[PDB]
């Protein structure tokens, strides 16, 4: 099909297997610390590249580009909030998780509160959140990229992709995945930078982009279907806030208070609390190296704006009648959906803007991002299931058995994702991305609050945490069931949900659910038994450095002050740069 693209992807696979087998020769497998924690032998650059590579994915490319096309810049906030919470992790949550010596976050709640129902319920919630908000993202986005760019078939494609990533995460463990995440982050950044350069050159540069976007509206607005007719001149034209990152608090998608607060909550979960990112930060050689990896991942998390959001706007510039279409039949003829065809921004940029060798390179960038994210999810899920369930159910099992347990759990989660693929194919346009951020906002905030109080409030107890979690779950479902039931649609076909339900954006609901769950924990804790202090040494941010003995209701973080000053300084510098970029883009 392509002479040079074949060799470029071959060299990509070559580097992949090379770093993989280099780590095999260096893996030191046979212990859970090896397979689930890389033996805690990871340094700054692989930790940072692993965080970035696992978080970045096909979902980021397709979603950020399509949203930039349809709406405008604002969606970049999703990425940039990470730059703060990641630091919170590296400086607040990772030290505790290190000085507690846990392999999972449910394990941390198991040995910080005490009991078998918190660990169980949180592991189950984490698994479901991974199936809904993470694997569906990447499967959907690889599906779109293949359906447009290549378009030979979509089931076979993503099934093969999951097969290769299954083999990858089975063989690897944390060491392989973090070294090959160095090489994959290199690949992703290089390719995406080249494509950004080409797009800026074709539009005429930053200035050429900021000039032509608000006039990037489609011309075909008839809708021969008599129901819609002459379209509002409001939903086929770009928003006048397309160039702004802080939209209106009420009459604007992604309102700024929602952005800041709600993403801080959901992202405190997404980084500081969930097993994927923390487990990237548990395989660290030391604490200082983990902080270095956090600053690196943050600096890279300032990147996906210019590499995914602005290219989507460029797509709307060059192909407005095809990505910015509104008319149901037109968009259906262009993509197959009748909701806007915004997702085709990045794939059509790649297909119509770059030559053969760079066609291969872009396919490799997409492949690397999807593989790294799925490998992260599968290994972290292996960690969670193996440790929590298999220990609560078979507390005396050899590591030659636990390795087997995790290895097979990878196969099972792959089969589950293949089974759930059609339920993901039933979403249209941006609907999936909305749905997933909504799921997170409904189900994350209680977990977020529980971890905040676990690390920062000694008082809370088993009743505290369990009842906050259950109350948060019921409150979240109260809104998720009806809202998801009524359906979804665009200006052409808007679903008839009540305004008091749909009118409150899911991030404001995340704030309210956060506060309800936190208040409920504090309430039902302050009117029940407390937990003594002897149980909480090296389990709360107050007692990090305690050397005294713990009661174990069921370390040695000494960073040299010099490198500590260095990593502190450049972390603060990273935040200064991120805050600048927030200001520059409104």
């Amino acid at each position: 099909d392509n002479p040079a693209d074949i060799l470029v992807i071959a060299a990509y696979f070559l580097l992949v297997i090379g770093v993989g087998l280099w780590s095999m020769c260096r893996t030191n497998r046979g212990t859970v610390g090896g397979y689930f924690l890389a033996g805690r032998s990871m340094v700054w650059w692989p930790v940072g590249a692993s965080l970035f590579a696992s978080n970045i994915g096909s979902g980021h490319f397709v979603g950020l580009a399509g949203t930039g096309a349809a709406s405008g810049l604002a969606v970049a906030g999703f990425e940039w909030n990470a730059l703060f919470v990641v630091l919170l992790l590296g400086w607040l949550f990772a030290p505790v998780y290190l000085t507690a010596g846990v392999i999972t976050m449910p394990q941390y709640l198991r040995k910080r509160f005490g009991g078998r129902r918190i660990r169980l319920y949180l592991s189950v919630l984490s698994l479901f959140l991974y199936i809904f908000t993470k694997i569906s993202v990447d499967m959907f986005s690889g599906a779109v990229f293949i359906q447009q760019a290549l378009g030979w078939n979509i089931y076979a494609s993503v099934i093969a992709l999951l097969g290769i990533t299954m083999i990858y995460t089975v063989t690897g463990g944390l060491a392989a995945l973090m070294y090959t995440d160095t090489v994959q982050t290199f690949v992703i950044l290089g390719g995406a930078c080249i494509l950004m350069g080409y797009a800026f050159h074709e539009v005429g540069g930053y200035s050429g982009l900021f000039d032509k976007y608000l006039g990037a509206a489609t011309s075909l607005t008839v809708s021969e279907d008599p129901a819609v007719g002459n379209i509002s001149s409001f939903c086929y034209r770009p928003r006048p806030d397309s160039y702004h990152l802080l939209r209106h608090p009420v009459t604007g998608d992604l309102p700024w208070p929602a952005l800041l607060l709600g993403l801080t909550i959901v992202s405190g979960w997404y980084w500081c609390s969930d097993q994927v990112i923390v487990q990237r930060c548990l395989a660290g050689k030391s604490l200082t190296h983990i902080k270095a990896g956090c600053i690196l991942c943050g600096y890279l998390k300032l990147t996906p704006m210019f590499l995914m959001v602005m290219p989507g706007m460029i797509s709307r510039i060059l192909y407005p009648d095809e990505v910015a279409c509104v008319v149901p039949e037109v968009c259906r003829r262009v993509c197959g959906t009748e909701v806007g065809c915004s997702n085709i921004a990045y794939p059509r940029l790649v297909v119509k803007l770059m030559p053969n060798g760079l066609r291969g390179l872009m396919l490799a960038v997409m492949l690397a991002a999807l593989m790294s994210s799925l490998a992260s999810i599968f290994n972290s899920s292996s960690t969670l299931f193996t440790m929590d369930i298999y220990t609560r159910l078979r507390p005396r099992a050899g590591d030659r058995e636990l390795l087997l347990v995790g290895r097979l759990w990878v196969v099972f989660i792959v089969v589950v994702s293949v089974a759930w693929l059609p339920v993901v194919q039933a979403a249209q346009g941006g609907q999936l991305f909305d749905y997933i951020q909504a799921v997170s906002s409904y189900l994350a905030p209680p977990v977020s609050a529980v971890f905040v109080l676990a690390l920062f409030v000694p008082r809370v107890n088993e009743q505290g945490a369990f009842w906050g979690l259950i109350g948060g779950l019921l409150m979240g479902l109260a809104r998720l069931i009806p809202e998801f039931s009524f359906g979804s649609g665009s200006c052409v076909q808007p679903s008839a949900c009540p305004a008091f339900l749909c009118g409150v954006h899911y991030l404001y609901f995340a704030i309210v659910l956060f506060f309800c769950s936190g208040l409920l924990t504090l309430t039902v804790s302050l009117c029940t038994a407390p937990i003594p202090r002897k149980h909480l040494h090296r389990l709360v941010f107050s007692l990090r450095h305690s050397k005294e003995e713990r009661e174990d209701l069921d370390e040695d973080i000494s960073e040299d002050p010099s490198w500590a000053r260095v990593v502190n300084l450049n972390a603060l510098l990273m935040m200064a740069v991120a805050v600048f970029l927030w200001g520059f883009y409104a």
């Binding site: 200064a576 805050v579 600048f580 970029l581 927030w582 200001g583 520059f584 883009y585 409104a586």
Partner: peptide, 30 residues
Amino acid sequence: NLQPWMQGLIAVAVFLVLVAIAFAVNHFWC
């Protein structure tokens, strides 16, 4: 006209002030 690279400096300024006060309370309150 308030250009965006002015907003950037304003945001950096308020961030620097916030961090300076945080380090002050660390130095005194710990």
